Amino acid sequence: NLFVALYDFVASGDNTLSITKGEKLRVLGYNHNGEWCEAQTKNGQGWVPSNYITPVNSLEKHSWYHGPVSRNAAEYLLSSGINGSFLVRESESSPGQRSISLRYEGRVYHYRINTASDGKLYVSSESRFNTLAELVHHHSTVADGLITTLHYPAPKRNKPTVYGVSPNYDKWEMERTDITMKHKLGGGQYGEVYEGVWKKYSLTVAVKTLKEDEVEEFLKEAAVMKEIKHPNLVQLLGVCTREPPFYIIIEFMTYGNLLDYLRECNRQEVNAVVLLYMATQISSAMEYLEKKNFIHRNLAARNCLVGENHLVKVADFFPIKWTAPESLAYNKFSIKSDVWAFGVLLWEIATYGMSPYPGIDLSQVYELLEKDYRMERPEGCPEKVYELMRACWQWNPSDRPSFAEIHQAFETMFQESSISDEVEKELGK
Template identity: 30%
Template sequence: MSSPSASFVQIKFDDILFYENCGGGSFGSVYRARWISQDKEVAVKKLLKIENEAEILSVLSHRNIIQFYGAIVEAPNYGIVTEYASGGSLYDYLSSDESEDMDMGQIMTWAADIARGIHYLHSEAPVKVIHRDLKSRNGNRFDLTICDFGASKFLTHTTHMSLVGTFPWMAPEVIQSLPVSETCDTFSYGVVLWEMLTREIPFKGLEGLQVAWLVVEKNERLTIPSGCPVCFAELMRSCWATEPKERPMFKQILSTLESISKDSQLPQQCNSFLHNKAEWRCEIEATLERLKKLERDLSTKEQELKERERRLKMWERKLIEQSNIHWNCSPVSSSFLSYTYNTPLLS
C-alpha cells in the first residue's frame, strides 16, 4: 500500500516567533513559539528537511494524537508546527516529585489514552501508521496526546524498518532492523505502562547498545516487582513477548483495560503498590546490577579473547622469524625446504 499524497498548510518562517527550546524530538529540536497571524501558541520542531512526518500528521485526527497545524518549508528553516502541550511530557512528570501522588485512576486514564491513540493509528486512521518510537517522552500529560512522529512510517505488508527509536522502548525486531508489524508499538506500550507503575527509568544506567544486546541476545526484560497487581504484570509480559504475533493488538489491550477497571478490589491493591515503592524498588535495582555485571563479564571475555588473539599473532611472528633464521643458517636440501615451507606454523 502506498502512502497518500498529503497536502498541508505551509506556514511562513517569519510568521513564527520563537521562544525557548523545549528539548529534542526524534530528528529535531522542539521550541515553544507563537504563530503570529493566528495568535496561537504552538510547538515547532525544527528539521534539516521535511520528510514523512508532516505527511503522516496531515492525515491524522484524534483527541489522543497531537494536533498538526502545518509545516515550514522554506529552506533551510524547515519545521513542523503543532499544538503546544503546556503540561510537558509524561516522562518529565514521572521523573518529578509530583508523580508521588499518582494513583490507579490516573494510570488507567493515561494507559487508555495511549492505547486509544495507537489503536487509531493502527486501525482507524486514513492509512495505517506504525509509530515506532512510542515512549513517555512522546506523551503529553493531563489529556494525554501522542506526539513526535519523526520515526513513524506508513505500514505496508513488507514494511522494513531502519534502526530508529530509543533502545529501552524498542522491540527486538526494530533493534535488528527486521520487517515489523503493528505489535512493535505494543512492545513499547508495555514499557510505558511499566514506567507509569514504577516511576523508574527503564534500564537506568545502561547504555543503549548494552540494552539492545540484553533484549535481543539475552531475552532480558524489565523487572516487574513482585507486589505489582497481577493484571498489570500479565499485560506487560504479553506486550514483551519475543514473537511479535504473540503480543496483543491494541483493540485487545483496550478490552483488557476495560476489564481491569471493573475490578472493585484492584484500586486499593494498586494504590498500596504505588505508595510502597521502598518495599519493591530493591528488586529493580538488583536486576540492574545483575545486568551490569553480565555486560561487564562479556566485556572481560571480549578483552581476554583479544589478548589471546594478540599473543597467538605474536607467537606466529616469532615462529616465522625462527624459521627464517633456520633457513639462513642450516645446510640446504630440497626436501627440507619443501617440508618446512608447506607445513603450517599453527594448527
Template identity: 35%
Template sequence: MSECVLEEIFIKRSQQKRKTSPLNYKERWFILTNEKLAYYDFDPEKGKRKGLRGSVDLEKIKCVEIVQPEPNAPQDRIYAFQIVYDEGPLYIFAKSEKVRAQWIKKLKEMVRFNKDLTQKYHPCSWMDGVWLCCQQEVKQAMGCKVLDGKNGFSFKPPGRRVSRKPLPPTPTEETPGRPLPPEPPGPPVSMTVIAQYNYTPVAPQDLELRRDEEYTILDKSDANWWRAKDKYGKEGYIPSNYVVKTEEGLERYEWYCKNVNRSQAEKLLKTENKDGGFMVRDSSKTGKYTVSLFTKSGGEPGGSCRHYNICTSSQNQFYLAEKHNFTTISELINYHQHNAAGMVSRLKHIVSNRARPPSTAGLGYDMWEIDPRDLTFIKELGNGQFGVVQYGKWQGQHDVAIKKIKEGSMSEDDFIDEAKIMMKLCHENLVQLYGVCTKQRPIYIVTEYLSNGCLLVYLREGLKQAPSTVQLLEMCKDVTEGMAYLESKQYIHRDLAARNCLVDSNGTVKVTDFGLSRYVLDDEYTSSAGSKFPVRWSPPEVLLYCKFSSKSDIWAYGVLMWEMYTLGQLPYERLNNTEIVAQVSRGLRLYRPKMANEKVYSIMTSCWLEKAEERPTFEELVLTVQDLLYELQ
C-alpha cells in the first residue's frame, strides 16, 4: 500500500448532481498518497473511515487552485479549493485557510510535472448549469482566468543557477501568450523490486526473472515492460506485473492472493482441503482486506470456509480480534498463525494462487508480429464474426487462442495499425492481445487463452451447480472493472455482451473483442438495420442515430448483467429486431430476473436511462457493485 502523505476530513461537493442543494455536501475522509487522492465515507461518532467513495490519479490532475466562496456560503464552506481533472472540477472545502494552503501547496508540488497542466482556470464554481465567474453554460468551457505560472506553481530544480535576466510579462486574457514549455523532468530515480514469478526471456532484449530475487529498475517509460538490471549486472526488459516494489507490503508475502474473490478463495481452500488453510485477499471494498480460512471443525461434511474482515482501529492499527492490534497486516498474520484469538482456528497452512502468473502485454518486449511457424494448432474452439478460433501453443509451451481472420470480413490494414495500441491495454479483466501474424493471408490474431471459454456458454452449460448471488455479482464486478479500465483509456467496446466475454480456469470473467466491431466489413453487422447488428444490447441513441459512446457501453453492460442473472437467456426473446427498436425507443425495458434482487435490478435500470448523460460511468458502477458485494458478504 502506498504511504500516506496527507489525510484530512473535508466537506466534498457531489460532482454528479445536476442541481445544487445542501444534500450535495458531505463529509469525506481524504487520503493523499504518492499515486492518488482517495476519499472515503466517514463515521463521525466512531471517528472511523469507512468505504471508498472515489479517487483521482495524481497523473491526471490538470490544475489545483482556490475557489471563491459560493454565494451565501455557510462558514464551513468558505475555504474552498478545486482539483481539475478529466472528469471535471472536484470541489473540496477545508476547515481553515491554513489547512487549505497546506493541501494546495503539497498537491501542486506533486503534480508539477504532469503533461496536461492547464493554463487557465475558473476562479468560481460551476453551479446549477453555469460558471459563476464568467457565466458560460458549458461545463467543459476553457477557464476564464490565466494562472500566474505553470498550474500556479513556481519550481526551481535543485542545483540550478537562477538566471538574472528579467522574466517576460505574464500573459493576460487580452494578449494570450504561447503555451508554457513543459518543466524538465527530474533526475531518473532507480527503484528496487522483487520478482513474484519466474519469467523466461522470449526475445533477445528480455531479462530473466527468478522468483523472490531483487532487481533494479532503470526505465519505466513503457508501463507494461520495464528495463531492469539483475544482481549480476545483466540488463533487459521484464513484465512490470511480475514484480513488486521492495518497500510495498502484501505482494511480498506468499499468503497474499491479489485479485481473488470470495468464491474463488473458497474453491482454492476446499481444493487444498487442509484444516487451517488460509489466504489474505482483497475485500470487495477497495483498500480493505479479508482473511479466508478453511476449517474441518464446523461439523459440515467436507469442511467449511470462514471469512474475517481485517479492521482498522481509530489509531490506524489492524485487527481481527479487537484486543489484538498490530501496526502492520504481516504482524497480524504472524500472530494469528500461532493464536486463534477468536477465530475458528489458527492460521496453519498458506494457500496461494501464485502458481499461475498473470498475462503479459505481448509475449515479449516490443513483440507484436508473431511468426506463424511458432504456432501449433491443437483444437477448434468455435466460429466467430471474423472466422475460426483455435486453441494452440506458441513455441510449444504458451497457451494461446488464435483467430484466423476470414478474408473480406475485416478492414485489415486499419486493424493492424491499431493492434500495437491495443496490445498495450493490460488489465486482469481484459483478454490480453499477444500479437498478430500479418505476413500471410489469412492474418491471425493471437490472444490469451481462457479454458472455460465463452461466458454465454458458461452460464448456460458450464456451471457445475446453481451460482450464488455473491458469485454472480463477483462476475459482474469483473466485467465492470475491465470496462472501467477501457473507459479510462477512452476505449469504446461497441459490442459488449456475454458472448464477448471469456472465463478463465478460476472463474474470473474477462472482456474480449473490444473495439473490433469498428473493423467489420459486413453491412448486416455494421448497419443498425442489419440482422446481425447487436440490437438487443443497444440503447436508443445507437438504434436511431448510430451514436456510440462509453454511455452506450453502459447500456450494454446492463443487458449483460441481465444475461448473467438469467443464466444466458436471450434479451427480449419474444421480439424481433424491428419490434425491439420501436419498443425500446418508446420506453420498454427488460424485466427483473428471478435471481436478481431489487438492488441488483436497480443497477441494471440505471444503465438503461433514456438520456445517455444520466447513466453512470463504469468507475461509478465499480463502487456501486463493490458496496453491494460488501453488504452481501
C-alpha cells in the first residue's frame, strides 16, 4: 500500500531520494536487511531509510503515537512539556497493551487503554470508541475521566537510528575530500579525534585519524565497529582506509562526554527522570553487547557521549575505581566485570559525576572490597537503584545480575510511581 514520511531525509548518495515529513510514497522494494527501501514520490525514485516512513494504514502516522516506549521513557518525553502534553504508547513486552501518558502540573499521569469484548477502546467505561484515533480525538476536547484534556502531542525530536549512510552491503569506504576537518575534539582530550562537517551527507562528524607513532589496531577497531549496531552504541558512519591518513567516522555528539555533562548541566532540567533515562539507555546498550558476547572492558561515565534530547551512546576512547576484584587480582575480564563497572557508572549518575570512593586511597580499595566495604547510598538515591548497584558489586562474578536482568529491572522499577517522588522522599528522610 501507500506510505507517509515521518521524518525529513536529505538525498546524499547518488541512489538516494530526498523526502519531507508528511509526503506520500510508494514502496518498490527493500535492501539486504530491510533497513532501507526503494521509494517513489512525485519528485523522484530512490533509496530512503525504512524507519523514516510508515504505511498510511498504521498508528505511527499520528504525532501522539510513540509506539513501544516505556513508562519512564514517556516521563522523559513529557519532561519538556506543559499541561496537556501527551502521548500514546504500547507495552514492548506485552503487545497490544496501550497506555496514555499525560502531563499535568509537573507530573505525568498514566492510563491504561481498555479493550471491550466487541473491540471498542476506552479509558472511561461510558466513552467507548471504535478506533484509537477517535478515543484520542474525544479526550482532546473533554477530559472525561482524565486529569485534563489531551492537547499537545509529545514531539518525536530525534531522527531514527540509521547504521551507516548507504543502503548497499558493506559500502563503508567514503571520499576523504567530502569532509572539511575542523579543530581537535574536546581540546585534544581524546587524542587524534577531530570535529568535521560532512556537507554531502548533511552531518557534523567526529573523525579519528591515524598518525605515525598502530595500523593493525586502527583497522581492527573499524572492523569491530562495523558489527556494533544499537541505538545507544556509537554507530560507524564510514572509513577512509585505502591511503593515509586513515579515518574512522561517527556522528558528532553535541554535549560531549557524560561525566563532564553531569558535572556542568542545569540540575533543574537534568532531574531524576532524565538521569534514569540516561542510565536505562546505557543498560540497553550493555544488554546488546552481552547478547553479542562482547566484553567492553572500559565502562565509565567518561566513555559515554551525550547528544540531543539526552540521547546517550556508549563508546570506547585511577581506572581501579571501576574495576571488578577478579580483574584487579587475576586480570580476568568478562561481561560480569562490565556489570561491576556499570554499578560504579550508576553511582556516577546518582551523584552528578562525583569521583568514586571519596577519601579512600587507591592502594586500599581491593582490601576494603574484600572486607565487604561498598560505597554508601548517594544522597537522594532511591533504595531500589542502590540495591541494583549492590547487586552489580557482588564479590563473586556469578552472583552478579546479567545485563538483560539489569535492563528488565529498570523497565519494571517505578511501574506504580515516579523516580521524582522516590528521590523526594529520600531527600526528606
